[PDB]
Design a protein around this nucleic acid. Sequence first.
RNA 1: CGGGGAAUCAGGGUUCGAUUCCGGAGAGGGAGCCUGAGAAACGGCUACCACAUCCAAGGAAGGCAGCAGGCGCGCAAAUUA
RNA 2: UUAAAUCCUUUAACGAGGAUCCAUUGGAGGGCAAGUCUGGUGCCAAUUCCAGCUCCAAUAGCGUAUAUUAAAGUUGCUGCAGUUAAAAAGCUCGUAGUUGGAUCU
RNA 3: CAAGACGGACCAGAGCGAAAGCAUUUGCCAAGAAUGUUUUCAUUAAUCAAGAACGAAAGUCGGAGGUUCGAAGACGAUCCGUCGUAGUUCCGACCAUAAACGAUGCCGACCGGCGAUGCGGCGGCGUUAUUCCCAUGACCCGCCGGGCAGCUUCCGGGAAACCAAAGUCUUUGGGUUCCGGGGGGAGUAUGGUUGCAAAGCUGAAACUUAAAGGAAUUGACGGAAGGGCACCACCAGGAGUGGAGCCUGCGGCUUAAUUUGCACCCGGCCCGGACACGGACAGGAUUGACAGAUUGAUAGCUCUUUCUCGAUUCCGUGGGUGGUGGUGCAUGGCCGUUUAACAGGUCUGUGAUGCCCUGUCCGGGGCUGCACGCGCGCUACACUGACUGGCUCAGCGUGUCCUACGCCGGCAGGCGCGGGUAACCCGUUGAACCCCAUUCGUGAUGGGGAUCGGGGAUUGCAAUUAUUCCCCAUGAACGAGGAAUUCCCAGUAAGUGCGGGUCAUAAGCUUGCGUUGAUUAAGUCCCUGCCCUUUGUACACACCGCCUCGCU
Length: 628
Amino acid sequence: HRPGPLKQQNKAHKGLSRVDQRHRASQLRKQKKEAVLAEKRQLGGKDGPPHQVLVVPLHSRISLPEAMQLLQGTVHLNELGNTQNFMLLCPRLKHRWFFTSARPGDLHVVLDMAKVADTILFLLDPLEGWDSTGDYCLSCLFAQGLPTYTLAVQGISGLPLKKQIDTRKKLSKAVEKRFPHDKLLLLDTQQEAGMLLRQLANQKQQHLAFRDRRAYLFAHAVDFVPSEENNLVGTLKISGYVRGQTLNVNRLLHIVGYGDFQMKQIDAPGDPFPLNPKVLMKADPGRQESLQAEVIPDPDEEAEAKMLEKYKQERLEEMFPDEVDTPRDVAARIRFQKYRGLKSFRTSPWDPKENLPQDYARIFQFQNFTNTRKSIFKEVEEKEVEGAEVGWYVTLHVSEVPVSVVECFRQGTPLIAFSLLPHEQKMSVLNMVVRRDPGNTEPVKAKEELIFHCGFRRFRASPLFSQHTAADKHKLQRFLTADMALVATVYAPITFPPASVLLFKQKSNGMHSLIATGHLMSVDPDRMVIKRVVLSGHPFKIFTKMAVVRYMFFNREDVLWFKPVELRTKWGRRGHIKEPLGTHGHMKCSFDGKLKSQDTVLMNLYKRVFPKWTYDPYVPEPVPWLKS
RNA sequence: CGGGGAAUCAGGGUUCGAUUCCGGAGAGGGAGCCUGAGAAACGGCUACCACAUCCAAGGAAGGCAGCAGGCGCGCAAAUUA
RNA sequence: UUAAAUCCUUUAACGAGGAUCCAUUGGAGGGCAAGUCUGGUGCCAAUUCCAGCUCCAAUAGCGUAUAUUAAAGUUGCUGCAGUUAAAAAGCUCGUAGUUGGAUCU
RNA sequence: CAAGACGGACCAGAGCGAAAGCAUUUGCCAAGAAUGUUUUCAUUAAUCAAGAACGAAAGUCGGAGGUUCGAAGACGAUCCGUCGUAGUUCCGACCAUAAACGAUGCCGACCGGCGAUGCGGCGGCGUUAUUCCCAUGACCCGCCGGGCAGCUUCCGGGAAACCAAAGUCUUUGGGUUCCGGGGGGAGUAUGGUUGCAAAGCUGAAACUUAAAGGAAUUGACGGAAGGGCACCACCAGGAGUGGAGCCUGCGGCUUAAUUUGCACCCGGCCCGGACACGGACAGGAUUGACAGAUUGAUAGCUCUUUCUCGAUUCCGUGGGUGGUGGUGCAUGGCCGUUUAACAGGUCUGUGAUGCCCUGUCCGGGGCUGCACGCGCGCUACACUGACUGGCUCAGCGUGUCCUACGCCGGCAGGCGCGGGUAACCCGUUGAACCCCAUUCGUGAUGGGGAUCGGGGAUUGCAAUUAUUCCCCAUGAACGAGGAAUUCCCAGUAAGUGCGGGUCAUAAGCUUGCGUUGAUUAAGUCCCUGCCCUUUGUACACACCGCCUCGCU
C-alpha cells in the first residue's frame, strides 16, 4: 500500500623503478628457462631413457623398410620374429633413440607401442592422406591419447616436378581435417632423414597424465626361469628402462595383456647401450608388499535372423520409448513382482543400499573417493619412495607368470608392464561415459559382451547403458543410441581417473570393430540403473473426468497390487487408479481432464538393475583390420 | 626511438605510428683500443661479467636485434628453395 | 613468360541437367530484418534440457574475443554541469596568473 | 545579607556585522554602511593557487569562580526520578569543525507592475509641543538613493517543485575563482602534514555491480471517523417461550416406506417398434375358449385338459436408425381486443427445420413411527385460587346447512314438526372473563391434567396403531424455571371467550371480532440492522534494521 500525503516521511539529507622491473623480468625468465632446460635435458640424454619413436604408415602404399633404412651415428639393430626395433645413438646431436614400427590394423601392437612411445611418426603417401585402415588406427590413437607426433610424406619426389608443389597443396587439405596446424616433412634422402631426426630431437613434448602418474616399462629383453616346466609357470626376467615414476617393488605389476602379477625383485645390471661409451639394489619382503586380492578375502542364417531381429528391436525401442506388452498368460503381479511405481522420477528418493545382491559382497567401496584420490596423488607427487627411479635399465624378477607370454615375445608382440597405484587391483563398479563412433552403426544390446580398453587395461565384460543426466537416478538404455553420450556401468578393477575408454565388438572374422570412446567418469557402486517398463491400454469409455480403460490387465487382483501407481497418457494428462471392473482387467480411472478416443493410457514400472559378473581379463588377438 | 605518416572526420578534436622513407641508437652487459680519410667497428681485436663448444685435461675456440632454420615464449607471425 | 621456370595472357583436344561441377556463416517466436510451427525429455496446464522445420541478413565470405575510435555535448576550446538529481570552499582583507571604462584625422 | 548566572515582556515584516554572531543604564575608545556633495587623486580596478586574520557548540593545557543546569557515575522505579563528577562562567593558549543553508561563488549590464518597511536627502499645505511667540521634534502627502522582505505576471527559463533569477542558452562567448563525471569499495588502506591529545587537511587501487537518483498526477483498497433512522435496535418496564405434560416443524435414529422441496413401500395385471440376417410355419405359424386351480381375491391377462381360427405369422442378435415421443424458430387462416396492431392468442399446414431419449389399474401398509439437538403453540405449576349455585353484559361474521320448539335418556346423543337464499329465522346472537354466595386451607393437597381399563353413541364403504365425544376408576412430572433473547406505548400488552377459510367427523393453523382492562417512557446510538458524508492519516501491506552451526 502507498502512504498518502498525510503520512509523515521526511526528505533525506544528502551528504618499481624501470631498472628494478627489468631485473624482476630477468629473474623470472632465468627461472623459467632453467626449469625448461632441465625438462628438455632429461629425455633422450645420458641421464634419461631413450626417446621412443613409433613409426606408423597410414597407407598401404608406403614401403616401411626403406624408410627404416633412411632413419638408420650408430645403430644397434635388435629384432624380433617379424618386427625390427633398433636403437640409435648419435653423439653428433647427443641423442638416443629407440625406433619401433607398427602396421595399422594390428590393434594391440599399435596401441601398446603407442602407449609407451614418446613420439609417433606418421607416414603418408603423396596422393591421398590415408586409407580406411589408417583412418581406423588414427581414430583408435586419438581415442587412447596422442603423444607428440610428426607427419612425414614419403614419395613426393617420385612425382613429376610440375605437379609436386600442387600435390603438397592438395595433401594439405587431406591433412587439415585431422591434423589442422601441422607441417609436412619429407623423407626421400639421407639429408631429409637427418633433418627429420633433428626435428624429432628438439621438439615440445606432449605429456600424458595416465602414464606419468604411474611408473611403466617397455621390456627390451625377456627370458624365463621355469620352476616346473610341466607346471608351465615360473619366474620371469624382464629387462627395460624405468620410464614414468620411481618403481617400488612393494606394488603390483600389471602386464597389459595378462593382468596383475606380484614382483619379487628389482636388479640393476649394466646399461647395454649407453649414450657415451650384476649389482642388485632392492628386496622383496611381504611386510608391505600388496597381495593379489581383487575379491573380498572374507568369503549361418540364424545369425542373420538374429541380426535382423536386433535391428527390428532397436527400431521398436526407438519409436516406442519403453513399451512392453502385458503377458496374457503370466500374472502381472508375478512377472513384474520386483517392480515399484514412482510419482516422481527425478525428485522422489530411493535408498542406495536397499536390496544389494551377492556380487556387491565381492567388491570394495570408498568412504570418499575424491579425498582418497587427492591423498594418493599428493603422495605420488610429493613423496619419494626408496625404489628404482627413472633412467636406469633395470631387470624385474616377477614371481609367477604363464609360460605362453614368453612365447608371445618370440613372435614380436611387445611386452609392456606398469606398476599399479594403491587400491587399483581391487574390483569395484566403474561408471564410464561413452559416445558412438560414426564408422559403425550395428545395434548394441545393453547386456552383451564387449571388449574394453580402459587405462592400459584390456578386458572382456558386459556393461549396462544408462543416460548421462544430472539426476540421482538414471533410466536404463537397452540399446546404445548412436547420437548422444551414454554411461556404461561395469564390474572392473579400480582405475583412478583420467583414463581413455575404447569399446570394441568382436566381429565374426576376428576383427574388433570400434564402438565407443571416452573417459572413465567414476568408480562408485552407489550409482544405480533404473529399468523403466511401460504398460499401455485403451480408454474405451470416456466420461467427465472419469474413464474406463481396458487392455491393462487380465486378472482382477493385478489391479489391486498395482493400485497406488499413478497413470499418465501420451497427450499429457495424468490419472489415478480408482477401481477395477472385474475378471478381465477393465478398470475405472480418475482423470484431471477429458480424454480423447485416440489417446492411450500408460503406467510405468521401475526396477533397480545392477551389472553382471562377466569380467574376463583375456582378450584374443585380432586379425589385421580391413574395410568391409 | 623521433619525424614524414595511419584511422575517424560537419567543424574542433581523439586514437595510433615497433614496421621498408629520413635521422638516431645498439650488436649478450660494461669497458679499452688497433688500422684507417672515416669505427670507440663487434660477420675486427683485448679484458672483466653472464652463459656456453671441443679436449688426449696441457690447452683451443665463441657472439643470428643478417637470410633461412630451431628451441623457448606465448593469443600471436612463412622455405634450412 | 623467364636467368631457368611457375602463374597470368593466347591457343589445339576433352570437359554441364539432380548442369551431385550440390555456398556458407550468423540471427529470429520482448525492441531495429525475421514465427499464432513440430517432436522427444522432467516439476507442480504452466514448465529444464535437446533435435528440427520456417523466415531474415550479408555473401566467397560470415561469426567471436579484446583494445580503441565514432555515436558522446559522459572531458564539453567549439560545447556540459554544480537549489531539490554527482557537485559552490565557514566567511571576508589576503601577492603572482587571468581580465581590465571613455578619449588623439 | 552574600554569591555566581542571565538581561524576558518591549522584541518585529525590524536593524547591524565579512561571517561566526549581536538586546540593562552610563561614560570613554577606535571603527562602519547608506545618504549629501559643482571637494580631491586620476585607472589607482575585478577574481582567486601560495601565504595569513576571524571562525557557534563540544574538546585539550594553565589559573580564578563554582548559583542554576548537567555528559559520566551512585541509587529508586521500569523513554523517568533523587544526588551530582568533567563541564556550563571569567582570563590566557590551542583545536578550525557544523543542516557554519538561500542545501543556491564574487564583480558588471539589460530586462514588468504594485504598495508596504529601515536609514539618509529634497519639495509641500495642514494638526500637534494645554491654539506652542520664528525654528525645531512627532504625525501627513509625494519624490530620489542604497537596503531587508512580500504579492502579482503567456518577460523568458525549468524534468517538475518553481525562479524577476534558477532569465537575457543549440538563435550556444562580459570577467574570473572553486569544483562533479553511474552505484559501491571508501573518506577505507597507504604516504605526507598540522595538533599536547581528540582529531583536522590531502587521499587511492584491486575488486564488485546494472543500476543509483530527482519531480509530479493518480483509480480501487479489508478498513477508520462523523451523523441520521428503526422496540423485526437500545434504557426503564409489561407478557413470556426456553423449567413440567401434550401437540407440531427441521435434522438425527429406526423402518419395506416412516414421500417431498399420494409424491412413498410391499405384491398381482396390462401392453412394449420397424430395418437386416439366421431360425420355425400348411406335416401347420397364430386367435378365441367350457371347466377346475393358483392367488389377500378372479382371471384363457396365469397353472392343467384339448375344441376350434387359420398366414392376419413369432424367436434371437445388432452400439444401424428410431416414433402414438418432449421441445424452439420462419410459416398461412381464425376469435376477442385497442387503413393499422396482436409481447392475449387460437387452428391437423408448410422447412428431407435445431436439439434430448427409444405408464395404467387392483389389495394392503406408511404419511414422524422416537434415544435426541434444533423452534414456534395449549394447559397449569394454586389462596389475585379451585368446586358448586345464582345473577348479569357484546361484536365481526356465516347459513341449505344454521337451527327455534316438543318428546326420551344422567350425558355424548336419537325421534317429530316449523323458520331461514337472510338487517325477516337461529338471534332482544341469554358467550367467556367479571360479580355475589358456599366449601376447600399452604398440604405433589378438592391444584394440575397426561398416561391407562371398561362401557355407550356419533361420522363415515372401513375407526385395528385408540377419527371424535360422553360417564366411571388412577392423579405422573409440574414448587416460577442462569444466561439465546421474542413482541410491545392506549382501549395497547395481557386475561377472556366467539366467527370465516381448510372440513362424510376431528381439533389445530391462520385470520379477525367483541368484554375486563394494566406498568414504564415522550428518551438514546451502548449493541444490532439499514441509509448518508469525509477519508485511504489508524491497524495491516509497504520502508529500513536485525536477520542457523559444526571436519577435511
